[PDB]
Amino acid sequence: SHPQNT
Amino acid sequence: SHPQNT
Amino acid sequence: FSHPQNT
Amino acid sequence: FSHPQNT
Amino acid sequence: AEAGITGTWYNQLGSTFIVTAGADGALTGTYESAVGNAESRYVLTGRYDSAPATDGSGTALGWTVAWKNNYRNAHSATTWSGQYVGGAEARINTQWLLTSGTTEANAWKSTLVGHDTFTKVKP
Amino acid sequence: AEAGITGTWYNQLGSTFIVTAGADGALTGTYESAVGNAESRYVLTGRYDSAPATDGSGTALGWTVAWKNNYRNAHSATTWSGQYVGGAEARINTQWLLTSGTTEANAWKSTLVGHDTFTKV
Amino acid sequence: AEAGITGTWYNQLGSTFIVTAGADGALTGTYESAVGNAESRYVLTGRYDSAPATDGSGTALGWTVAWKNNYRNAHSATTWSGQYVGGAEARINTQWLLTSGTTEANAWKSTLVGHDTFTKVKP
Amino acid sequence: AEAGITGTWYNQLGSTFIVTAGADGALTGTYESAVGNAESRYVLTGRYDSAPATDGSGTALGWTVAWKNNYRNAHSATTWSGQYVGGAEARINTQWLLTSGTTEANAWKSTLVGHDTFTKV
């Protein structure tokens, strides 16, 4: 998962 | 102007 | 990932 | 174009 | 599957893309600006995934236009890379690179990047 | 110069790009990874400017590989956009976009971008 | 002009960007995912054109987030590059690059590219 | 390694990038073109990972230059995204996006993309 997007 | 877009 | 494009 | 970024 | 991609498509700036998907993974067709008519028509060639993952995954595809036809030559080529998403409203979402032929000294500013969304209108 | 594109080219990671340039602008051939084996090979098609400018400019070109052959399907496609420069040391300088087929939730992280320099060496 | 850019903005995936434009061309603020609350908040720094061309030209700007705060570290940085277009509906249109720290061998697939549109909601 | 980023770096076209890396992830400094003169200089700000991974990975970083100083305003901004690799030959490998402020009619051709490699040489 990356924090840039959900 | 380029032909790709108007 | 790991893909055919390189090495 | 011609811009400050290079040369 | 090929049938889904084959048709007439249009992007948000009003350009036309007509494409046929062949069963070996080939894409062939023509690309036009919104001015319409004959010469804005250029040849495109590309490849797509002919055996996509099931799921609600898109089908990856890509194509190239070199901006030279029998009436004009812009000394440039664009490649679009993206995915076909099927449904009621089928769409192709892409990102594109436009490279112009330059001299060595100006090579650092040769390539434009952008993105296009195509909506389908006919097979 | 124009058909100087026809040949065998190598990028900086050892991948091999074998192309035929047609007189009217078609680009056709194969691409294969390093490791060598006869199917790491994938088909490519493209287009190039068959009548470039007469000042010292490069020849614009582009091509596509969908990453499916009879052995593997990586459910993706890469496009390279760049220009060929002739001379005693010819090369093709490119940038590329790799898109994978994803679900809608992952669509924002579908595309990688990179750059390759092909020479005949 | 700074006042136009200063505020709370949101992109199409529901992330939050809070920014202050200073009169020397500086941008400072925080960036959040749609999960909301504290830790999804990361520090951003950027620069914008503080003396734009008049016309209906946009204002060019850019900023960086490195994805490490006091709760998480994704070992990656994103840069957004685009332009502020003012009006009734003010918008920031961007393209972005996400680079992850990799070993030498995987460096060729280190960078993601994409595009975001931000709509303003508050100063 | 971490603060090995602080210093003077040169890209392959002779531009100079002078940076200070802060302990908590801030990047601050100046960028100037070749030709040399004391205002081809522009201010930059950025962020880097101040606690990178302990396997042999690079340090992710990025920065922005808006192309306005007291002498010139090119009505544009460039962002570089990449990673620093330490060692006997350290370098920063990047890709960049140059956006110009345009009218809506020209918005589709607003952004150039390219790549730079900075070394201390």
UniProtKB/Swiss-Prot annotation, chains F, H:
Biotin binds at residues 31, 42, 80, 96, 108. GO terms for cellular component: extracellular region. Keywords: Biotin, Secreted, Signal. Its main location: secreted. It comes from the Bacteria. GO terms for molecular function: biotin binding. It is found in: Secreted. Residues 1-121 form the Avidin-like domain. The biological function of streptavidin is not known. Forms a strong non-covalent specific complex with biotin (one molecule of biotin per subunit of streptavidin). Homotetramer. This is Streptavidin. It comes from Streptomyces avidinii. The chain holds residues 37 to 157 of 183 of the full protein.
